[PDB]
Amino acid sequence: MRNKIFISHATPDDNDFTRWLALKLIGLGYEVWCDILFLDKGVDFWSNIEKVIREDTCKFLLVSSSYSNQREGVLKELAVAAKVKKQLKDDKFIIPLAIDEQLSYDDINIDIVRLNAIDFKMSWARGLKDILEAFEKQKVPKEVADASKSNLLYQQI
Amino acid sequence: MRNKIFISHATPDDNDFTRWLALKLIGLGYEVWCDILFLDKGVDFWSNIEKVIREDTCKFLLVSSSYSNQREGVLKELAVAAKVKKQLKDDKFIIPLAIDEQLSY
Amino acid sequence: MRNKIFISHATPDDNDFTRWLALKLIGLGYEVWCDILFLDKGVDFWSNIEKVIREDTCKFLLVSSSYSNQREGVLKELAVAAKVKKQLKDDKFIIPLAIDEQLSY
Amino acid sequence: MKELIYIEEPKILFAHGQKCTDARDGLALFGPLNNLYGIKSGVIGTKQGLKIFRDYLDHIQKPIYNSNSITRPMFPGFEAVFDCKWESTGITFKEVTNEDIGKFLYNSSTHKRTYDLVSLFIDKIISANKNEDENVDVWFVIVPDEIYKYCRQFHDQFKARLLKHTIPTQIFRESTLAWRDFKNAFGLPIRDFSKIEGHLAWTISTAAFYKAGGKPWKLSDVRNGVCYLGLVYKKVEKSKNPRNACCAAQMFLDNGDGTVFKGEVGPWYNPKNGQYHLEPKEAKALLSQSLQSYKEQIGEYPKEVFIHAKTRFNHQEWDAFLEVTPKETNLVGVTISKTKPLKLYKTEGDYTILRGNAYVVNERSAFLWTVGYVPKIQTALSMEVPNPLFIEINKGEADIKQVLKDILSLTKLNYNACIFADGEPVTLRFADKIGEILTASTDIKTPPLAFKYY
Numbered sequence: 057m058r059n060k061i062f063i064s065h066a067t068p069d070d071n072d073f074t075r076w077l078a079l080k081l082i083g084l085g086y087e088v089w090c091d092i093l094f095l096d097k098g099v100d101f102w103s104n105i106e107k108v109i110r111e112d113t114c115k116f117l118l119v120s121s122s123y124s125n126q127r128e129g130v131l132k133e134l135a136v137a138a139k140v141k142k143q144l145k146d147d148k149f150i151i152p153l154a155i156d157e158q159l160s161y162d163d164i165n166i167d168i169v170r171l172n173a174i175d176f177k178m179s180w181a182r183g184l185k186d187i188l189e190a191f192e193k194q195k196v197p198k199e200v201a202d203a204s205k206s207n208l209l210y211q212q213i
Numbered sequence: 214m215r216n217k218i219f220i221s222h223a224t225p226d227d228n229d230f231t232r233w234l235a236l237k238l239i240g241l242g243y244e245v246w247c248d249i250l251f252l253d254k255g256v257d258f259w260s261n262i263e264k265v266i267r268e269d270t271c272k273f274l275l276v277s278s279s280y281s282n283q284r285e286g287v288l289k290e291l292a293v294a295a296k297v298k299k300q301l302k303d304d305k306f307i308i309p310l311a312i313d314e315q316l317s318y
Numbered sequence: 319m320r321n322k323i324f325i326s327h328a329t330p331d332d333n334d335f336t337r338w339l340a341l342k343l344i345g346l347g348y349e350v351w352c353d354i355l356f357l358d359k360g361v362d363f364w365s366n367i368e369k370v371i372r373e374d375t376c377k378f379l380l381v382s383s384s385y386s387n388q389r390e391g392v393l394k395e396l397a398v399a400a401k402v403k404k405q406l407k408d409d410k411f412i413i414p415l416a417i418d419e420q421l422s423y
Numbered sequence: 424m425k426e427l428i429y430i431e432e433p434k435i436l437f438a439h440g441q442k443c444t445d446a447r448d449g450l451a452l453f454g455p456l457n458n459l460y461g462i463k464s465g466v467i468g469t470k471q472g473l474k475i476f477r478d479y480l481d482h483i484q485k486p487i488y489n490s491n492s493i494t495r496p497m498f499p500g501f502e503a504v505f506d507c508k509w510e511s512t513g514i515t516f517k518e519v520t521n522e523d524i525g526k527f528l529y530n531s532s533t534h535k536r537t538y539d540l541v542s543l544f545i546d547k548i549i550s551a552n553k554n555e556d557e558n559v560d561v562w563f564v565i566v567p568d569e570i571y572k573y574c575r576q577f578h579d580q581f582k583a584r585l586l587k588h589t590i591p592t593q594i595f596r597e598s599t600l601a602w603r604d605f606k607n608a609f610g611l612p613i614r615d616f617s618k619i620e621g622h623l624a625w626t627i628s629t630a631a632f633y634k635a636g637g638k639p640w641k642l643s644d645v646r647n648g649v650c651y652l653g654l655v656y657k658k659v660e661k662s663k664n665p666r667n668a669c670c671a672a673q674m675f676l677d678n679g680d681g682t683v684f685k686g687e688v689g690p691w692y693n694p695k696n697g698q699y700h701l702e703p704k705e706a707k708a709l710l711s712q713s714l715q716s717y718k719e720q721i722g723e724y725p726k727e728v729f730i731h732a733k734t735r736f737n738h739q740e741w742d743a744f745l746e747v748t749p750k751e752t753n754l755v756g757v758t759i760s761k762t763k764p765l766k767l768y769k770t771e772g773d774y775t776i777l778r779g780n781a782y783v784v785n786e787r788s789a790f791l792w793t794v795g796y797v798p799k800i801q802t803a804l805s806m807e808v809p810n811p812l813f814i815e816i817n818k819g820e821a822d823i824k825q826v827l828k829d830i831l832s833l834t835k836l837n838y839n840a841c842i843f844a845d846g847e848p849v850t851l852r853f854a855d856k857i858g859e860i861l862t863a864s865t866d867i868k869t870p871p872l873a874f875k876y877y
Contacts, residue, residue: 166368172258181502190254
């Protein structure tokens with residue numbers, strides 16, 4: 057069963073927000089897959105990345121920003137995400153999160169130019185509440201929340 | 214069957230009155246639809262609102278103001294609603310609600 | 319500077335009309351960008367198509383039909399074209415071309 | 424050849440019982456102990472000060488960044504951290520005209536200008552507090568750079584003259600909030616915050632959240648039945664004598680369940696200059712008040728009282744302390760100094776000594792590098808070689824290891840700032856703060872005892 061929330065960002069510029077959000081969602085009982093938790097490195101990930109997108113990822117959160125707009129790895133991720141979304145026929149698969157204020161809504165990339173984004177330009181807590189409400193309305197799988205997991209993950213990594 | 218009342222407004226200028234009206238109509242038993250509450254996060258929203266207008270909308274409670282007079286999204290919803298009206302030939306389909314005294318008649 | 323004429327259609331169903339129109343326009347001295355004439359292929363086009371729309375296109379001809387109405391690629395091109403039209407402040411940017419008889423207004 | 428024993432860093436407990444080593448990271452990840460619904464702000468100052476406070480309040484709603492996010496973690500935003508609304512829409516402004524400021528500022532006297540300016544400010548605050556319908560939690564007094572420059576005396580008198588009314592107040596300078604535009608005549612910003620801005624937001628937000636009734640964190644590893652008293656001595660310059668010694672104390676117990684930190688005060692006076700010793704009556708009064716304050720909250724007497732200080736007690740006052748305590752409570756007394764310049768250099772020549780190193784001279788003395796190198800943020804707390812605290816057990820019998828552990832734990836609970844740790848235990852620093860405030864106006868009966876008023 058697909059129970060992993062995938063996060064795609066533009067390393068290294070989007071690390072503060074992604075660390076904050078990933079630890080927040082880990083503390084809220086979700087199972088977040090982003091490349092920054094598995095920063096131990098040493099093993100190739102492209103095959104692993106596509107495998108986790110196609111096999112277990114249930115939601116593809118995309119950090120839309122002035123850096124991740126034209127990043128090649130994020131573009132490949134969006135291509136695979138579009139393919140798996142069409143395979144699953146799920147309209148609510150990819151969720152952009154607008155974070156950069158200087159990224160105008162008229163210069164957004166073609167692959168997310170039509171989807172309804174979640175706005176973090178004003179407040180991170182407002183956007184987080186939007187994310188949580190959207191997830192609970194879309195019945196995203198989750199277990200009981202525990203801040204201990206976020207604590208030990210932050211300590212380990 | 215059509216049982217949803219669409220509200221089309223300007224965003225975010227007319228959001229307070231839209232929220233008040235939506236909550237009032239929901240509290241009475243009438244199913245409503247506006248981008249404030251019933252829009253999802255990632256839908257291809259233009260297609261979703263077009264489908265809602267063309268498939269389930271029974272009333273189109275437009276909010277007329279000095280802001281939503283020339284708002285492009287409201288105009289597009291208005292055109293789709295006019296097409297739906299001339300499809301079912303119900304003249305009371307579109308209902309404007311005047312709230313701004315600075316918008317002359 | 320912008321001189322190309324982007325013809326957006328649904329492939330491979332509107333290929334006869336788009337072929338005829340693209341060849342007619344090329345014979346008339348209009349620089350035309352379309353997918354069917356770039357069928358040499360070899361590289362990804364989504365980023366290329368978005369760049370072409372945002373950079374060099376001067377008219378966005380849209381081939382309306384029962385095929386290219388809800389086609390997702392055509393919709394994405396339409397959304398980008400709307401953004402470019404807002405950017406350029408040109409009201410006459412998108413020029414639809416109704417083709418098929420079974421697609422009512 | 425000498426040995427250095429290492430004392431490990433303690434943990435400060437954040438929301439839902441999650442231990443951590445940094446306050447900033449724990450707050451940005453877990454949240455504070457208690458939740459406020461919001462902060463209702465009253466602003467005193469000119470119209471320009473109101474505009475500046477409004478724009479800064481709007482600014483700290485968004486995430487802020489430092490240059491290097493390892494030395495100083497970034498600020499997610501006020502609501503993302505504290506789960507509280509502190510907006511510019513809750514502003515209750517009380518306008519103060521510039522001519523009003525000038526008509527007391529442009530006099531010739533030095534004490535009288537400060538007296539009159541503080542008088543006008545506190546009268547406006549008290550009038551707004553007594554007879555306005557709104558409820559204001561913290562009053563934010565924005566001052567221009569034309570008062571505090573020529574009023575030093577302003578801050579101490581300001582905080583002393585609001586004591587009988589108990590209004591939590593925070594003083595700001597217009598250059599602190601508007602550093603970007605408040606450059607010199609040369610155009611150089613004299614208060615460059617461009618590389619620290621996130622840390623400035625952290626400290627300001629933490630202070631504001633504390634003064635409005637919120638507890639941002641606490642101590643997780645401390646034993647029950649023990650109490651600590653930080654005693655400081657201050658000079659009363661405005662008394663009849665040129666100097667009149669006054670003792671002020673800050674109390675720290677745990678609680679029936681956790682984290683009580685109040686401060687038993689009311690300055691105990693010594694008339695003779697240069698004698699930083701409490702007379703037997705003063706010592707009995709102070710110790711009895713402290714013991715009652717502990718007992719009436721816990722219900723039982725403490726199992727240990729740990730009177731910190733900066734000076735050494737003599738036999739008279741220690742005997743007096745021993746008379747006013749029952750036969751179960753073990754009483755210790757430790758004097759902490761900074762007059763032994765043991766600047767322990769490093770043999771690598773790249774960074775300073777690690778924080779937490781102690782040179783234990785004997786069973787009744789030691790050193791402690793409370794300020795040193797902390798690896799979690801890849802930097803030291805100082806710029807030059809730090810000077811360690813020379814901790815000696817002046818009176819009583821106790822374990823020096825426990826003393827060093829307790830001092831290191833007490834180096835954490837600083838609510839006036841959001842940093843990794845302090846340099847001196849918070850009992851001494853906070854007792855110094857409230858003893859400095861209490862002597863600003865020598866007419867005060869039964870002070871509030873709570874730090875948010877100081």
